Every structure is written in structure tokens, then in C-alpha cells.
Amino acid sequence: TTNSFLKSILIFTILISSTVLLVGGYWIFKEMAPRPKEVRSESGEVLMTKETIIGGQAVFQKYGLMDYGTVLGHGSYMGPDYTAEALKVYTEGMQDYKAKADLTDDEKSIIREQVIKEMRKNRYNPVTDVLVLTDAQVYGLEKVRDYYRDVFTNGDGWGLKKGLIKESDMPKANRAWVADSDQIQQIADFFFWTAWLSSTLRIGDEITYTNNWPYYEDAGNTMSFSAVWWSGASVTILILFIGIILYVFYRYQLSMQEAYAEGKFPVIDLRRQPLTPSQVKAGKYFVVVSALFFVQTMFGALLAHYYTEPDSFFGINWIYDILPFNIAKGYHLQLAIFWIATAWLGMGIFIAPLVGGQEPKKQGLLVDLLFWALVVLVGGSMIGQWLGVNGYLGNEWFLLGHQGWEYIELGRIWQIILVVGMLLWLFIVFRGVKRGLKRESDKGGLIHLLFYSAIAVPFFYIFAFFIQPDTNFTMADFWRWWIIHLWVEGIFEVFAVVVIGFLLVQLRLVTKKSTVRALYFQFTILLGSGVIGIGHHYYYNGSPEVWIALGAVFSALEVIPLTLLILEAYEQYKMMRDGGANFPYKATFWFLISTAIWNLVGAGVFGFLINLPAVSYFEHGQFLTPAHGHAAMMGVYGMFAIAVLLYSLRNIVKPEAWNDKWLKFSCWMLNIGLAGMVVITLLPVGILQMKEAFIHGYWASRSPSFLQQDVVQNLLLVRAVPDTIFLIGVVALLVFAIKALFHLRKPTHGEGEE
Ligand SMILES: CCCCCCCC/C=C/CCCCCCCC(=O)O[C@H](COC(=O)CCCCCCCCCCC)COP(=O)(O)OCCN
Ligand SMILES: CCCCCCCC/C=C\CCCCCCCC(=O)O[C@H](COC(=O)CCCCCCCCCCC)COP(=O)(O)OCCN
Ligand code: HEM
Ligand code: HEM
Ligand SMILES: CCCCCCCCO[C@@H]1O[C@H](CO)[C@@H](O)[C@H](O)[C@H]1O
Ligand SMILES: CCCCCCCCO[C@@H]1O[C@H](CO)[C@@H](O)[C@H](O)[C@H]1O
Ligand SMILES: CCCCCCCCO[C@@H]1O[C@H](CO)[C@@H](O)[C@H](O)[C@H]1O
Ligand SMILES: [Ca+2]
Numbered sequence: 001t002t003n004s005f006l007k008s009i010l011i012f013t014i015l016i017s018s019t020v021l022l023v024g025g026y027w028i029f030k031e032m033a034p035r036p037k038e039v040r041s042e043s044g045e046v047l048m049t050k051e052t053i054i055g056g057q058a059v060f061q062k063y064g065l066m067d068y069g070t071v072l073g074h075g076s077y078m079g080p081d082y083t084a085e086a087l088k089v090y091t092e093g094m095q096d097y098k099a100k101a102d103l104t105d106d107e108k109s110i111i112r113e114q115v116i117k118e119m120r121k122n123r124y125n126p127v128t129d130v131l132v133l134t135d136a137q138v139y140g141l142e143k144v145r146d147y148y149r150d151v152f153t154n155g156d157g158w159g160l161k162k163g164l165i166k167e168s169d170m171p172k173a174n175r176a177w178v179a180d181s182d183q184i185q186q187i188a189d190f191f192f193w194t195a196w197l198s199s200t201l202r203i204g205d206e207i208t209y210t211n212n213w214p215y216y217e218d219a220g221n222t223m224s225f226s227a228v229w230w231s232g233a234s235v236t237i238l239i240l241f242i243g244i245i246l247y248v249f250y251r252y253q254l255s256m257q258e259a260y261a262e263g264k265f266p267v268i269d270l271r272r273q274p275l276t277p278s279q280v281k282a283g284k285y286f287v288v289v290s291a292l293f294f295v296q297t298m299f300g301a302l303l304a305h306y307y308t309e310p311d312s313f314f315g316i317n318w319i320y321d322i323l324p325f326n327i328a329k330g331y332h333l334q335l336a337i338f339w340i341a342t343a344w345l346g347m348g349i350f351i352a353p354l355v356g357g358q359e360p361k362k363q364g365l366l367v368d369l370l371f372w373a374l375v376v377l378v379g380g381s382m383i384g385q386w387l388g389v390n391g392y393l394g395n396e397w398f399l400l401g402h403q404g405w406e407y408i409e410l411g412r413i414w415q416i417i418l419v420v421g422m423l424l425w426l427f428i429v430f431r432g433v434k435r436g437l438k439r440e441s442d443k444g445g446l447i448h449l450l451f452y453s454a455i456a457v458p459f460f461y462i463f464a465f466f467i468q469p470d471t472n473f474t475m476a477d478f479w480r481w482w483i484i485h486l487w488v489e490g491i492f493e494v495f496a497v498v499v500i501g502f503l504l505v506q507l508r509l510v511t512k513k514s515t516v517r518a519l520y521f522q523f524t525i526l527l528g529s530g531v532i533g534i535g536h537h538y539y540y541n542g543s544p545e546v547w548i549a550l551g552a553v554f555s556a557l558e559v560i561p562l563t564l565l566i567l568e569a570y571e572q573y574k575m576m577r578d579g580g581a582n583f584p585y586k587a588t589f590w591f592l593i594s595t596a597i598w599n600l601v602g603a604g605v606f607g608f609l610i611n612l613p614a615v616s617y618f619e620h621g622q623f624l625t626p627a628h629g630h631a632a633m634m635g636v637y638g639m640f641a642i643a644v645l646l647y648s649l650r651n652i653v654k655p656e657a658w659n660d661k662w663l664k665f666s667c668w669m670l671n672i673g674l675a676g677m678v679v680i681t682l683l684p685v686g687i688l689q690m691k692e693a694f695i696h697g698y699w700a701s702r703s704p705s706f707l708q709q710d711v712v713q714n715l716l717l718v719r720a721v722p723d724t725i726f727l728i729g730v731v732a733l734l735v736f737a738i739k740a741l742f743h744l745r746k747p748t749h750g751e752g753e754e
């Protein structure tokens with residue numbers, strides 16, 4: 001019964017938090033805004049069907065518009081937020097209709113006040129799944145309908161391609177998820193719906209389906225009491241647990257303990273370290289991620305450029321033609337997850353034999369096969385997205401094209417091959433680790449924790465399948481976050497962490513006992529806050545008001561594990577020094593230290609800058625999000641993948657040919673460029689955008705007009721300095737990765753024994 005209490009706590013933590021998530025997931029499904037079978041006029045004339053709404057949404061996904069603009073605050077920022085934009089047109093129309101822009105202030109005052117009392121009342125009948133909206137509202141739906149035809153025909157005057165939506169892209173009828181009916185009448189309908197629920201009070205409630213989001217006086221949308229109350233409450237509870245957790249941490253020495261006495265640093269003679277065929281093979285895996293990282297960055301360089309030159313890349317043409325923003329955005333995200341994720345899969349391949357003590361038969365065969373599987377998935381899924389967004393696909397867009405969800409842009413069949421790949425990956429890990437699991441008595445020991453977490457990789461991605469074109473937006477978004485917030489960060493904050501403990505225990509740098517106890521404490525505080533903390537993504541996506549409290553409180557608690565960081569980085573810096581200038585893993589530790597600090601700064605402080613519900617009310621879907629997004633994503637996960645990538649490359653390259661000079665330069669260039677792009681550009685624009693929404697309405701902050709202000713542009717223009725500096729750091733890595741195959745070692749043992 002070695003770490004019994006810690007296990008109960010962890011198990012209990014996972015059990016309780018999972019329940020709350022599921023219950024809250026149920027409350028959403030049951031309280032989210034409805035998609036009436038028929039929405040119609042006072043004359044009884046139907047204008048909308050649940051099937052239309054589902055269709056509009058479908059074409060929105062079909063054309064990957066979530067990689068251009070947003071809806072309900074989620075998606076890209078080049079374009080506007082259709083919900084807020086559609087809401088304005090619809091609101092403006094209701095004004096004109098009742099206006100029968102020239103009235104007196106004393107006059108426009110009366111009308112705008114009239115449209116307020118009229119549009120915020122729920123006219124949906126639960127007994128009968130049908131909604132009826134006044135004439136003043138139908139006239140508004142018209143302006144909305146007209147507005148977007150113009151848009152999806154003439155363009156939006158900023159980055160969006162002309163007449164991108166065309167019937168010729170899909171069959172006469174019998175269209176996959178989109179309905180038999182004009183496509184750009186469905187979209188306008190989808191947008192109108194999100195705008196409908198964002199401005200209409202919840203039945204019996206006093207605020208709307210989105211807790212009064214977006215901010216917009218003319219529609220009566222203003223900050224809710226819960227948004228302000230939970231801002232204070234969440235932080236007070238955080239203060240309460242910081243003290244509590246700190247005490248627990250201090251009293252049980254729940255951290256790694258050095259395994260060596262003063263001056264007795266362990267010898268790391270890499271020359272006499274067993275190496276195997278599957279490991280050397282996993283070595284080239286890293287050069288590819290290094291390459292994908294290179295392209296991923298490039299697309300980022302392209303996206304940033306488009307904020308200054310909307311329809312061209314320095315006058316050139318094909319670029320905005322074949323690689324427009326939405327498409328480029330998709331690849332940027334897709335490749336980020338791809339290169340970071342597969343860096344750890346490789347790391348898994350690499351240590352697998354070490355855990356077992358030998359090379360599994362056909363390991364190199366399986367490894368090599370896994371290799372050409374992703375390479376296909378990647379090259380393939382991307383081709384798919386191009387064909388899909390462009391229309392050179394039929395009803396195969398959802399299966400092979402662009403699924404239409406930011407972060408989840410690949411097609412369903414592309415997702416299927418993904419899981420099988422991970423499943424295969426899992427098998428490969430298990431094959432090499434299997435015997436370790438057998439030697440390890442304690443079923444909750446290092447190797448078991450390493451294996452349990454390894455399986456969460458493929459498994460947890462399966463929740464994505466609860467998502468498909470006809471799913472209600474807020475409910476589908478609910479599941480999307482299980483992948484973005486729980487999965488990606490489950491790949492990294494659990495699997496990676498146990499992998500590092502394993503490595504440090506192997507190098508004989510920290511006691512094994514010390515390490516597993518530490519992992520238990522972290523996992524419990526990590527899952528104890530983060531599982532429910534997922535809810536801060538549900539503040540305004542249409543979810544019930546209860547998630548404002550749940551999300552605010554639990555995401556705030558996510559900061560606790562983060563503070564036991566700047567000081568963990570130091571313990572690591574410390575042991576890095578205990579190893580002289582001949583310490584083999586310098587480069588690795590510099591990136592390790594870097595991820596801890598960015599975890600405090602990028603996720604901890606920049607993430608919190610936008611976490612308060614009071615703040616997020618205005619900020620949600622603005623530049624501060626990407627500010628935090630890069631600081632955390634690249635700062636934490638990118639650096640971590642790199643640390644592990646260099647760690648493996650070190651056990652593979654011939655020492656004599658190794659030089660971490662270039663890596664020092666990379667580390668410096670990457671860190672400086674990341675901070676610079678955040679601080680010099682993303683942050684100041686984020687503030688302006690939030691101020692602009694606070695004073696004129698959120699619609700004004702998401703209009704291309706905002707991006708056009710000279711002040712914004714200049715801020716946008718100087719992003720090039722730090723962006724170029726960051727770029728240089730990645731090429732230096734790439735160059736070091738590539739010309740690293742030229743100095744590889746060859747397997748020491750085969751299917752033998754270490
Ligand atoms: C909006 C603000 C966000 C700020 C986020 C900043 C993130 C902090 C970055 C930390 C990088 C840590 C890198 C490892 C540091 C520990 C090991 C180390 O520094 O050893 C250095 C070489 O290190 C190295 O060669 C490692 C490279 C160090 C490069 C640091 C550049 C980061 C600048 C961050 C501020 C813009 C040896 O020389 P010394 O000056 O004696 O080392 C002591 C200094 N730590
Ligand atoms: C909504 C979802 C939220 C996220 C939930 C998943 C999070 C995944 C990430 C990390 C999970 C780490 C889980 C570690 C739990 C360890 C519990 C445990 O081992 O307790 C053990 C028995 O374990 C056992 O006998 C086996 C039980 C533990 C392993 C079961 C499989 C778990 C894999 C789950 C991944 C999908 C008690 O007895 P032992 O000490 O092992 O045995 C005697 C030792 N002398
Ligand atoms: C030369 C460096 C880079 C540049 C110039 C850059 C630029 C950009 C731009 C312009 C966007 C637009 C988001 C939008 O308007 O919708 C973006 C989003 C994003 N980037 Fe990058 N990027 C760079 C590096 C990276 C790296 C290294 C990672 C991590 C592996 C990363 C992760 C992301 C993520 C997750 C988003 C989406 C966040 C959001 O939409 O709020 N980026 N980036
Ligand atoms: C290493 C850990 C973390 C990573 C990689 C990360 C990454 C990201 C990314 C990429 C986004 C943009 C999502 C999108 O495109 O819509 C985002 C949004 C967000 N993150 Fe994090 N995050 C981390 C930790 C945290 C923490 C600790 C907090 C709590 C303070 C937090 C709060 C938020 C919030 C509130 C948003 C939503 C912004 C909006 O709706 O406008 N994050 N995060
Ligand atoms: C979320 C925080 C969970 C904290 C769990 C602490 C479990 C402490 O457990 C205790 O650790 C002592 C050594 O420090 C041992 O001597 C005790 O026998 C053991 O019961
Ligand atoms: C600090 C965290 C406090 C969380 C309080 C959650 C209170 C949930 O309260 C429940 O909300 C449901 C809708 O989601 C309603 O249908 C239920 O009737 C209501 O009791
Ligand atoms: C993105 C640009 C990547 C450039 C990588 C250049 C890698 C050069 O690599 C070098 O090439 C030489 C022959 O020219 C060989 O003799 C060296 O052994 C080899 O390391
Ligand atoms: Ca986004």
C-alpha cells in the first residue's frame with residue numbers, strides 16, 4: 001500500500017471533477033438556446049427551420065470561416081464576429097422598421113428604447129418547438145439576409161474573397177449537411193440565430209442565453225451581475241487555496257529530491273549508453289517536427305502580414321489565392337498541435353525500449369510504419385482542407401475536407417486515421433514498456449503512471465466524435481474544448497511531466513520515490529482545477545449562467561500549480577549547474593527552465609489577464625487572447641517539445657559532433673521573439689480593442705475598421721522585428737536538426753538486452 005492516500009486523493013479528484021463536468025455538460029445540452037423546427041412571422045409564415053439553421057452553420061464550417069472570423073466570440077480575428085455583426089444589422093433594421101437615422105436624439109432615443117423592450121423577450125414555445133418573431137424583427141432578419149449575400153458575393157472589403165459561396169460547390173440537391181435551398185440564405189439564418197439567442201432573454205431568466213454577450217447597448221446587452229460577482233469570488237477562493245496548497249506542499253515535501261550528495265553528481269557517459277534501432281529511428285522523427293515547426297511558423301509570419309496587406313503578400317498573387325488567411329490559419333493551428341504532439345510521441349518511442357530493457361521485435365518496423373502514417377495524415381488532411389474550403393469536393397467536405405471548427409479543421413476520416421495512428425503509437429509504447437510494467441510491483445509507480453497517461457493520448461481524442469455538422473453550436477463547442485483545453489493539455493501536462501520525471505530518475509538525478517509522490521500531488525491539483533476550469537470557455541458560447549461561476553472559480557485555481565514553477569525551474573537550473581560545463585543536457589534544461597517560466601508568465605499571468613468574467617465580457621474574442629495564446633502555447637508546450645527533442649537528439653548524435661552553441665542562440669532568439677511579439681504588438685493592440693469595445697460596442701472592435709486605424713497598423717507593422725527574430729531562432733533549430741542526421745550513431749544492441 002505504498003502511496004495509498006495520494007492515490008485516493010487523485011482518484012477521488014478525477015472522479016468528482018469528471019462528474020461536475022458531465023453534469024454541467026448535461027445542463028448545457030438542456031439549457032442551451034433551441035433550434036426551433038420552424039421560426040415564423042405573426043402571419044404564421046415560416047422563414048426558418050431547424051434544418052436551415054443546421055445548414056447555415058454547415059456552410060460556415062464548409063468554407064472554414066471559423067479560421068477567418070468568429071461567432072459567439074470563438075474563431076479567428078481577421079474577420080469580424082458574425083454574431084455581434086449580424087446582431088447589429090438585425091438591430092439596426094428593427095430600428096428602421098419602427099422608425100417608420102434622421103430622427104432627433106430625443107426621438108431616436110424613444111425608438112431604440114422600443115426595440116430594446118421588444119427584442120429581449122423570449123417568444124419561443126417550449127411546448128411546441130416553434131418560435132415566432134414580430135414584424136420589426138422580420139424586417140431585421142431581411143437586412144441580415146441582404147447584408148451577408150452582399151458579403152458572401154461582393155466580399156467584406158477586408159481579406160474575404162469575393163463570391164466565395166456558390167451553389168456549384170455542392171450538388172443540385174441532396175447536399176450532405178447543408179439543406180436543399182440557397183446556401184447564403186442558410187448562413188444568414190445561422191448567423192441570425194446565434195444573434196437571436198445572444199440577445200433574447202432565457203425563459204424565466206433576466207439575462208440572455210449568452211449572459212448578455214456580446215456587449216451592445218442598442219440590444220440591451222450589458223454586463224451581468226454574475227460576471228462581476230464571480231470575478232471577485234473566484235480570486236478570493238484562489239487566495240484561499242494558494243495558502244492551503246502551499247501548506248500541503250511544504251509539509252509533505254511534495255517535490256522531487258536530489259538523489260546525489262553535495263559534489264557527488266552522477267556521471268553521464270552517453271558513449272556507453274545502450275541505443276536501439278527504434279530509438280535511432282525515432283531520431284529522424286525529431287528533424288521532421290523541426291521542419292513542421294519551421295513551416296508552422298512561416299504560416300504565422302504570413303497571417304501577421306495579412307493584417308497589414310489583406311489580399312496580398314508584398315504584391316505577389318498566387319499566395320493570397322492558394323494561401324488565404326482562413327486556410328493559412330487552419331494550417332498554423334493544425335501544424336502547431338502536429339509538431340508539438342508528435343515530438344512527444346517520438347519521445348515515447350525513444351524511451352519505450354529503455355523502460356522495458358530491450359528492443360521489441362518488429363519495433364523498427366512498426367515505428368517506421370507509424371512514421372509514414374502521420375506524414376500521410378498531415379500532407380493528406382491539409383490537401384483535404386484546401387479542396388474542401390475551395391469547393392473542389394462534394395458531400396465529402398465533412399469526411400475529407402474542412403470540418404469548420406478552429407483547432408479541429410481536419411475531416412472526420414482524417415480524424416479516424418489520427419486515432420488509429422495514436423492507437424498504433426500506444427501499442428508501440430506498450431510493446432517496449434510492457435516488461436517494465438511487469439517488473440514494477442507498485443501498480444501506481446512511475447512506469448504505471450507513465451503508461452496510464454500514455455493511453456489518455458489516443459483515448460481522450462475520441463470525444464471529438466461527439467461533434468458533427470448538425471450538433472447545436474454551444475453543445476458542439478462544449479465538446480470541442482475537451483480537445484483543446486483538456487486533451488492538448490493532457491498530452492502535455494501529464495504525459496510529458498511523467499516522462500520528464502522518468503528521465504530525471506533514470507539519469508539518477510532525483511530519487512524515484514520522491515518523484516512519483518510529486519507527480520501525484522501535481523496531477524491532483526492539475527486535474528482538480530483544470531477539468532472544471534474548462535468552463536471559462538463556456539462563459540459566453542451560449543452555455544447556462546452556471547458556468548460563469550464554475551469556470552471562473554476552477555480556472556483561477558489553475559494558477560496554483562503554476563506558482564510552484566519559477567521555483568521548480570530554479571531547482572532544475574541548480575542541478576544543471578551541479579553538472580559542470582561538461583553536463584550533457586544543458587540545451588535540454590534551458591528549454592525546460594524556459595517552459596516553467598513561460599508557464600508562469602504566458603499561461604499564468606497573460607492567461608489570467610483575460611480570465612475574469614467581468615473582463616472577458618469585453619475581451620472575449622480579441623487580440624489579448626492570441627497574446628496569451630502564443631505566450632502559453634509556444635512558451636510552454638513549444639519549449640517543452642524542443643527540450644525533449646534535443647534530449648533525444650543527444651542520445652543519438654555522436655558527442656564529438658555535438659555543439660549546443662547554436663542551441664543557446666536558438667533558445668535566446670525563440671524566447672526574445674516570443675516576448676517581443678506579445679509585448680510589442682499583441683498586448684497593446686489587445687488593450688485598444690478592449691477599450692474600443694467598452695466604448696462603442698463589441699461590434700466596433702471586431703470590424704475591419706478597427707484593424708485599419710493607423711495606431712493599430714503601426715503596432716501591427718512592428719511585429720516584424722520580433723517575428724523575424726523568432727523566425728531566426730527556429731531556422732537555427734531546423735539547421736541543427738537537419739545537419740544532425742549526418743552525424744548519427746548506429747544501434748548498439750538489437751533485439752538483445754541492456
Ligand atoms: C512578457 C515577458 C515574458 C518573459 C518570458 C521570459 C522567459 C524567460 C526565459 C528564460 C530563459 C531561461 C534559459 C535558461 C536559464 C538558466 C541557465 C542559464 O541561463 O545559464 C546561462 C546560459 O543560459 C542560456 O544560455 C539559456 C538562454 C537564456 C536566454 C534568455 C532569453 C529570455 C529573455 C526573456 C525576456 C525578454 C549561463 O550564463 P549565466 O549568465 O551565468 O546564467 C545565469 C542566468 N540565468
Ligand atoms: C473526465 C476525464 C478527466 C481526466 C481523467 C484521466 C486522467 C489521465 C491522466 C492521468 C491519470 C493517472 C491515474 C493514476 C491513478 C493511480 C491510481 C492507483 O494506481 O491506485 C493503485 C491501483 O491502481 C490500479 O490498480 C489501476 C487504477 C489506475 C489505472 C486505471 C487506468 C487509468 C487510465 C485512464 C486513462 C484513460 C493502488 O494500488 P497500488 O499502489 O497501485 O498497488 C500496490 C502497490 N504496492
Ligand atoms: C513567427 C512566429 C509567429 C507568428 C508571426 C504568428 C502569428 C499568428 C497570427 C497572426 C495569428 C492569428 C490569429 C487570428 O487572428 O485568428 C496566430 C494564431 C495562433 N498562433 Fe501563431 N504565430 C507565430 C508562432 C506560433 C507558434 C510557434 C505557436 C505554437 C506552436 C503558435 C500558436 C498559435 C495559436 C494557438 C494561435 C490561435 C490563437 C487565437 O486565435 O487566439 N504561433 N499566430
Ligand atoms: C500551458 C497552458 C495554457 C495554454 C497552452 C493555453 C492556451 C490557450 C489558447 C491557444 C487560447 C486561445 C483559444 C482560442 O483560439 O479561442 C487560450 C484561451 C484562453 N485561456 Fe489559455 N492556455 C493555458 C493556460 C491558461 C490558464 C492557466 C488560464 C487561467 C488564468 C487560461 C485562461 C484562458 C482564457 C480565459 C481563454 C479565453 C479567451 C477568450 O475567450 O477571449 N489559460 N488559451
Ligand atoms: C492534494 C494534496 C494531497 C496531499 C497528500 C499528502 C499525503 C501525505 O501522506 C503522508 O506522507 C508522510 C511523509 O511526508 C508519510 O510519513 C505518511 O506515512 C503519509 O501518510
Ligand atoms: C462555486 C461554484 C458554485 C456552483 C453552483 C452551481 C449551481 C447549479 O444550480 C443548478 O443550475 C442548473 C442549470 O445549470 C439548474 O437547472 C438547476 O435548477 C440549479 O439548481
Ligand atoms: C532550411 C535550410 C536548411 C539547410 C541545411 C544545410 C545542411 C548542410 O548539412 C551539411 O551538408 C554538407 C554538404 O553540403 C555535408 O558535407 C555535411 O556533413 C552536412 O552536415
Ligand atoms: Ca481563436
Ligand SMILES: [Zn+2]
Pocket residue numbers: 485533534536537
Ligand atoms: Zn482553458
